[PDB]
Amino acid sequence: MNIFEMLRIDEGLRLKIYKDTEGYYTIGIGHLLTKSPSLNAAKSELDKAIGRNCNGVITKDEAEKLFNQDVDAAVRGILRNAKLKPVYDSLDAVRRCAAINQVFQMGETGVAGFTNSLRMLQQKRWDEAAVNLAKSRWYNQTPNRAKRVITTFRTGTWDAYK
Ligand SMILES: Oc1cccc(Cl)c1
Ligand SMILES: [Cl-]
Ligand SMILES: [Cl-]
């Protein structure tokens, strides 16, 4: 198991513009296109991102390409954050995959409000962090996925992904 397989499991793969759990235009492997409600805005964004007139549809390779760049950006976004980096570097390899997944899902922004949980994770108080992490809009909005990530951080193993 690795980050790609793990997020591929959590985000699915769609080759046509779709709305995500929050109602926003997205495509491929969880790639957010825009928060605007204008489908035309979304198609534009898509064309800009792919480099061609897509008409709301992309290829698997196109989707995989967007994904790579997105994982990359996420990690990099972590390492660039001063509040984040130190937490991330204190963790082992599995748990680091769980940090990337949350950031990929919510942005470095969404994640900045987890301060308390971040501290517990840095302190390696797993069970405590897991409880703190559940007390959030994120777990209440996408519980099944939040569960798998939380278990991941709690255990340091890939069991929730089987
Ligand atoms: O979202 C998270 C959670 C833990 C560590 C980092 Cl770096 C990010
Ligand atoms: Cl792009
Ligand atoms: Cl879910």
Describe this structure as you would to a colleague.
- Substrate binds at residues 32, 104, 117, 132.
- One of its GO terms (biological process) is defense response to bacterium.
- This protein has one domain (1-162): Orthogonal Bundle (Lysozyme), CATH 1.10.530.40.
- Helix content is 62%, strand content 9%.
- It is built from 9 helices and 3 strands.
- The chain has helices spanning 3-11, 39-50, 60-80, 85-90, 93-110, 115-122, 126-134, 137-141, 143-155; strands spanning 14-19, 25-28, 31-34.
- Strands 1-2-3 form a 3-stranded antiparallel sheet.
Strand and helix map with partners:
Elements: H1 3-11, E1 14-19, E2 25-28, E3 31-34, H2 39-50, H3 60-80, H4 85-90, H5 93-110, H6 115-122, H7 126-134, H8 137-141, H9 143-155
Helix pairs in contact: 3-5, 5-9, 6-7, 7-9
The structure holds 3-chlorophenol and chloride ion (CL) (2 copies).
PDB class: hydrolase
Keywords: Glycosidase, Bacteriolytic enzyme, hydrolase
Assembly: monomeric
